[PDB]
A paper describes a structure:
Protein phosphatase 2A (PP2A) is a major Ser/Thr protein phosphatase that together with Protein phosphatase 1 accounts for more than 90% of all dephosphorylation events in any given tissue or eukaryotic cell. Each holoenzyme consists of a common core formed by the scaffolding (A) and the catalytic (C) subunit (two isoforms each) and associates with a variable regulatory B-subunit into a heterotrimeric complex.
As an alternative approach, we identified a chymotrypsin resistant core of the PR70 subunit (residues 130–483) using limited proteolysis together with mass spectrometry. The structure of the PR70 core fragment (residues 130–483) was solved by selenomethionine single anomalous dispersion (SAD) phasing and refined at 2 Å resolution yielding a final Rfree of 19.3% (Rwork = 16.2%). However, we find that the structure can be more accurately described as a tandem of two calcineurin B-like domains, which we have named CBLD1 and CBLD2, connected by a 12-residue linker (residues 301–312). Calcineurin B-like domains contain four EF-hands, which are arranged into two so called EF-lobes, i.e. pairs of tightly interacting EF-hands. In agreement with previous observations, only two of the EF hands of PR70 are loaded with calcium. These EF hands correspond to EF5 and EF7 in the present structure, but have in the previous literature been referred to as EF1 and EF2 respectively. As a result of this unusual arrangement, the chelated Ca2+ ion is coordinated by only six atoms in an octahedral pattern, with two of them being water molecules. The structure of PR70 in the heterotrimer shows small but significant structural differences as compared with free PR70, supporting a degree of induced fit upon binding.
Residue numbers in the entry: 134 to 481
């Protein structure tokens, strides 16, 4: 059998032929896989399609409601990225926020063969879901706006991964977003720190994570609001599991575009988009003191600065920009120099 036509009338006709198979021409969630195929969508769009047509409100979706919606989508959305954003977005918002992904991911948990074991343990559903969503925004939401647009989604590999869910029974093969194994490792590291089990960790806890390799001034910036995704205004002195995920991923690889932005935001004390000499010295100050505790005589700030200027080659004298750090391709060295002491554990 040859491929289906792509045009509007043909697609609508195919949808109608599919709904004609349903009692009362209303689709339940169990029918939505067939509906996804009629739409030329990957299987795991079934949840988004159902919720998109308000299925959660009445328990089913009539052909008339679904067709009217899909007509609109085909009029407004030329590609998969546009269609996906349209399905998940809140009315009034031309973008996706973290919470928009929850029903989709819950359906993935409820139905994907690779998560069957997890499905019967709803205790950890939300934490798995939270983890996947963090990894999605970490990779996709390059503007740090908290709002994923069609353009951002289009530039990512996210939808490719969604399409692959139906092809891979072992979800752990899909390492970028959905991997349960990646979630497990991340969660267990959080668990080690959260010793009183209140699902929050403080600065003392966070310092333990890599054996006090990060300076206390940098640890304090993690708690400042500079990188929090939770939009909280007050300095609460504790961070959530969700924010820990962002820290862990950033700390383990300081070379990725998102991670460079993460550490840049922390160093950018006044949040003006440039690292001033005051800001660099503020951090390097503590590095020297820590190095002293290890019988290492640190370079004076101006000597260290010579080497960093040569490493980074910033465009404008007197400041280091995010663009400078990305272009030098050695931002991890820059960051480590200013706030990371790998073998600080061995200090005497
Ligand atoms: Ca705790
Ligand atoms: Ca600044």
């Amino acid at each position: 059998r040859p491929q289906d036509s792509v045009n509007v009338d043909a697609v609508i006709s195919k949808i109608e032929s599919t709904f004609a198979r349903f009692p009362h021409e209303r689709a339940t969630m169990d029918d939505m896989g067939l509906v996804a195929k009629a739409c030329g969508c990957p299987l795991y769009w079934k949840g988004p399609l159902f919720y998109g047509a308000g299925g959660e409100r009445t328990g089913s979706v009539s052909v008339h409601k679904f067709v009217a919606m899909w007509r609109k989508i085909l009029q407004n959305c030329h590609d998969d990225a546009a269609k996906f954003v349209h399905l998940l977005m809140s009315p009034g918002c031309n973008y996706l926020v973290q919470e928009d992904f929850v029903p989709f991911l819950q359906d993935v948990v409820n139905t994907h063969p690779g998560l069957s074991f997890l499905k019967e343990a709803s205790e950890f559903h939300s934490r798995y879901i939270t983890t996947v969503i963090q990894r999605i925004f970490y990779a996709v939401n390059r503007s740090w706006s908290g709002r994923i647009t069609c353009a951002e989604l289009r530039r990512s590999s996210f939808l490719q991964n969604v399409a692959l869910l139906e092809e891979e029974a072992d979800i752990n093969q899909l390492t970028e977003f959905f991997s349960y194994e990646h979630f497990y490792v991340i969660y267990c590291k959080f668990w080690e720190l959260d010793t009183d089990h209140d699902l929050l960790i403080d600065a003392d806890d966070l310092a333990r994570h890599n054996d006090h390799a990060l300076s206390t001034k940098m640890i304090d910036r993690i708690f400042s609001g500079a990188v929090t995704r939770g939009r909280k205004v007050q300095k609460e002195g504790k961070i959530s599991y969700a924010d820990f995920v962002w820290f862990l991923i950033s700390e383990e690889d300081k070379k990725t575009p998102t991670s460079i932005e993460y550490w840049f935001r922390c160093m950018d004390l006044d949040g003006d988009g440039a690292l001033s000499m005051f800001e660099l010295e503020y951090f390097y100050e503590e590095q020297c003191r820590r190095l002293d505790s290890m019988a290492i005589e640190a370079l004076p700030f101006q000597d260290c600065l010579c080497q960093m200027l040569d490493l980074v080659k910033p465009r404008t004298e007197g400041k280091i920009t995010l663009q400078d750090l990305k272009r030098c391709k050695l931002a991890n060295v820059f960051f480590d120099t200013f706030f990371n002491i790998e073998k600080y554990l061995d200090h005497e």
